[PDB]
Structure formats: structure tokens, C-alpha cells
Design an enzyme around this catalytic site. Sequence first.
Site, PDB file in Angstrom:
ATOM      1  N   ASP A 111      -0.335  -2.537  -1.825  1.00  8.81           N
ATOM      2  CA  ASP A 111      -0.859  -1.595  -0.656  1.00  8.81           C
ATOM      3  C   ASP A 111      -2.490  -1.380  -0.826  1.00  8.81           C
ATOM      4  O   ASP A 111      -3.024  -2.086   0.300  1.00  8.81           O
ATOM      5  CB  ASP A 111      -0.354  -0.037  -0.835  1.00  8.81           C
ATOM      6  CG  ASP A 111       1.546  -0.292  -0.545  1.00  8.81           C
ATOM      7  OD1 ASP A 111       1.710   0.371  -1.835  1.00  8.81           O
ATOM      8  OD2 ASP A 111       2.098  -1.377   0.343  1.00  8.81           O
ATOM      9  N   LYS A 113      -4.756   1.048   1.009  1.00 10.19           N
ATOM     10  CA  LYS A 113      -5.249   1.077   2.188  1.00 10.19           C
ATOM     11  C   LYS A 113      -5.597   2.576   2.136  1.00 10.19           C
ATOM     12  O   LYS A 113      -5.293   3.181   1.666  1.00 10.19           O
ATOM     13  CB  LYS A 113      -4.100   1.089   3.826  1.00 10.19           C
ATOM     14  CG  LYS A 113      -2.506   1.667   3.346  1.00 10.19           C
ATOM     15  CD  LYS A 113      -1.324   0.723   3.355  1.00 10.19           C
ATOM     16  CE  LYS A 113      -0.164   2.136   4.430  1.00 10.19           C
ATOM     17  NZ  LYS A 113       1.099   1.913   4.125  1.00 10.19           N
ATOM     18  N   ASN A 116      -3.537   5.287   1.956  1.00 11.37           N
ATOM     19  CA  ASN A 116      -2.385   5.728   0.529  1.00 11.37           C
ATOM     20  C   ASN A 116      -3.698   6.210  -0.967  1.00 11.37           C
ATOM     21  O   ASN A 116      -2.978   6.359  -1.582  1.00 11.37           O
ATOM     22  CB  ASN A 116      -2.210   4.154  -0.450  1.00 11.37           C
ATOM     23  CG  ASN A 116      -1.404   3.527   0.155  1.00 11.37           C
ATOM     24  OD1 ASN A 116      -0.544   2.701   0.488  1.00 11.37           O
ATOM     25  ND2 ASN A 116       0.243   4.961  -0.041  1.00 11.37           N
TER      26      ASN A 116
END
Lengths: 255, 263
Positions: A111, A113, A116
Site C-alpha cells: 500500500d 499511500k 495509510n
Amino acid sequence: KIRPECFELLRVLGKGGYGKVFQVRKVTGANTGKIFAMKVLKKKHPFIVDLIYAFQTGGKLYLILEYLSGGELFMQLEREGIFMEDTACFYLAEISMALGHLHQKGIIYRDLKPENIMLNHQGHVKLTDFGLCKESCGTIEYMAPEILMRSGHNRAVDWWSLGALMYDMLTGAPPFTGENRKKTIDKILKCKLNLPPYLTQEARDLLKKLLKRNAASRLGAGPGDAGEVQAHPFFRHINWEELLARKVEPPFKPL
Amino acid sequence: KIRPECFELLRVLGKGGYGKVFQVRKVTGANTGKIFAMKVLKKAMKAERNILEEVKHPFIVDLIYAFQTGGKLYLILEYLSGGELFMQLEREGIFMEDTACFYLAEISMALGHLHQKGIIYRDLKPENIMLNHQGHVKLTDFGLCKETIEYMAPEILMRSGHNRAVDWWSLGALMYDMLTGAPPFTGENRKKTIDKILKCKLNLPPYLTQEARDLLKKLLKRNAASRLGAGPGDAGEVQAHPFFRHINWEELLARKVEPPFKP
């Protein structure tokens, strides 16, 4: 003891992933009054969010994760884009430590990103271990290089994402954005990274080495992992013991 | 009806791969005295049989019978009297561009069909590549072969390592080993060879036509995303290439094109 009724729902924090994540007051128990984040699935590191309780019941797996006030402060600092180079160097540095440790424990994030990345009352980074994070003889002279290096499932995926994130923190957007999902994915795969004029000499060098299409040569892909990336000149001003200690002042603490 | 003893063992073919493979002669049955290849797998050690059962292509080894016994699986595959293609490489040393082009095209078609079926080879050494009595390509050895975003790595974005592009590199490698007498990258040891591949500095012999070299640089492209054949056109992109300009596909698929070697 601890069960789903030990909690009262205050607000929803996100549909984030599969399952909703609620903010919550513990009603009974020892921590009566204390606020937590409870993640419901329809069935120790300073930069990793601590888990407190975990229980299974009527087909729903419950996760009582510590609550982080600056839990969405990052995703807002990037909307103001008040990110300066030295400012970003801090967050990328703590995340690099967070990634290194997850890697040693054999976990890849994938992930990574900005959505996050959470912060604690002090303003330091805190990551999770989502449900999108994964774990990790004949003759080889005829098979593709991607097979020999365990592609998309080794820890080099994370260092590309560290770059993409860095890229967005310093310009206003991710490296390869497209008018639709299709064009974006293609611009990503086909690349041709465009580095703005204002990026510093060290910033651009690191960006070119994290956003290397060839995972094998990608910085951080070697056995030294995060040591490779932390050693970049862009990180020359960081004192890793002082950083690890949370003794380095975050430029933005959620007031 | 079919059982093990309907077959008399004529020779052990290879202990290569899981289990063993025998040449057999059928004794009972209708087609009697028919010579075959029989893969014997001790049950105790998408599928080699699932794939062979479904695939019905002229450039891929046909499967005739399949059955299970005392913790054993029996695949009776067609026998191939042409041996291995690259044995003819040992002899000839290297192949002329059109000699290799013939064999490569046949393999391209075989790979194309396997691809349309969601099957990817992953290996394709110069040893899964056999020849039948006629002298045409026969793909043989399998086993159990395979099958928000703004910040994700391209590998994850395209299933790098588990897509069709994997076989196209192999074709490339094979080709490179066909014209020049060696594989693209090798070293005094395995770790040295692997490094060579990962950091692929492609060394093209000066005596290659522009066609051959355009396809090798297009096939042996380190980035699977743009590797020739990685697109939705699949073998279409590969066969289109001017290196194959003298190939008639309808003809070739009909085995009406003649192999430069009749064993």
C-alpha cells in the site's frame, strides 16, 4: 472478559479497506473511559500502531487498536502542501525505519499511500499491518529476470512506494497520474519520470533511485534494505538514534 | 478399460521431472503394438494432466489415456521420434536465421494457443522442445503450470512474474541460443548467471540481420511491460514482426511448411 459490548461507538473513522473502523470509548473493563479505534472485519515498534485487544464473536473479528489523534493529520498536511523538503525528510525517514522493521519481520506493505500514514499526539508516524500487506532448480539461463527475483512479492515494492510518496510530498501529486485508471496504470508501467526543476540535487537522485522500474536495481532492494536508502545524502541530516527515540521534533504535531 | 499392463515397457526415456517416463508398447486394446510415451507419477511426492487433456494443438504433445492406480498417475502421451530440437543444435553448432525462424514460429503458435487458454509455461528451456516423426515442434514437459494505485509499484500492477510476458522472454533466450550457440546470459556459477540476467546487458553478435536483432532486443526486454508479446495481441505482436515476414501461418499450422531437418 473483553467482548464487543465493552465498547460504545462514537464515530466512524473510515471504511478503510474491508470492514469499517470505528472510534470507541471503553465502557466497562479497566480502561473505562479510554478512547480506542475498533476495526471490525466481516468474517512493538514506535512507528507501528499498537494493537490492544483482539476477539472473535458472531462471525466478526474485532481489533482494538490504539487511537491516534493526528490520525488523519498527514492526509491534510498534503492538502495544504505546506511540505518543504526538510519537512518531508522527517516523515520519509521515520517511514523508512517503519518499513525496515516490517521487512526484517518478513512483511511487505505494498500500500504505502498517503492515506495509510497516521500520526500520534506527538506527530510521529504510525503504520498498520493491513489486509493488503503480504509475507516475505532446473536451469535458469532461459527464464525471465522477474521470475528469478520473486517480483511484486519481495520488499522492493515498498521502496517504489516510498518514492511515489516522496514525489507527492514535494510536488503536489504522484509520479504517474492519469486521466483515468487505465491511462494511469499504463503511465506507471511505461514510466518516464519527470523531475521538476525545484527538486534539490539529493532529492532528485533519491527519487530516480526509488522509482527505478527495474526492481533488482531499485534502491533498498539489496540485502541492506532500509540501510541502503537511509544512507542516501538526502538523509544526511538525520540522526537515527534520536529519530528512533522520537526525540526528534516533528515539524507538525496535531494541536 | 485401460490399465498399466496394457503396456509393455520398451525403454526408460528420462527420469527428468517428477516421476519417470517410459516408452511403451500397447499389447491389449484396439490400437495394438502402438508405441507410446508413458509418464509415471507416484501420487506420493492447472495440472500436468488437466492441461494436456484440454490442449489440442499440432505443436504440443497429445495425450491419449490417463488413469490412476496404487498411488500412481499414468499419462500415456504420444511418442516423439524426433528427439530434442537442440540436439540438432549440438550438431549444427548454430542455426541459420531462417532455420531457427521456422522452429521459433512453430513454438510461437504453440505458446499463443497456451496463452489464449490462460496457461503460461514459466520455463520453456530448450528441452521441453521436442520433435515428432515429421520434424515439427512439440511442446512437452509441464508439471502443474501457472493458472489507490497511484503509489503501487509496476510489478504489482501487472502481476510481474506471473503473466504471459514470461514465455516471450524465454522464446527470446531460446532464439538467442539458436543463432549464437549459447544462451543470452551465463556465468561460472548459478549466482553469477542469475546476476547477469537481472542486470541484463544484452550482447548481440554482429552477424545478425537487423530483423533478428530487433526481435531479440524486443523479446529480451528486461521490463516485461513493453516486452514484445506482453500486449493483448500476444503471439500476434510476435508473429507480426518482420523477422517472421516470410512465414505463412495458415500453412505452418497445417504442417505444410517443411522443417530444415528431417530426422
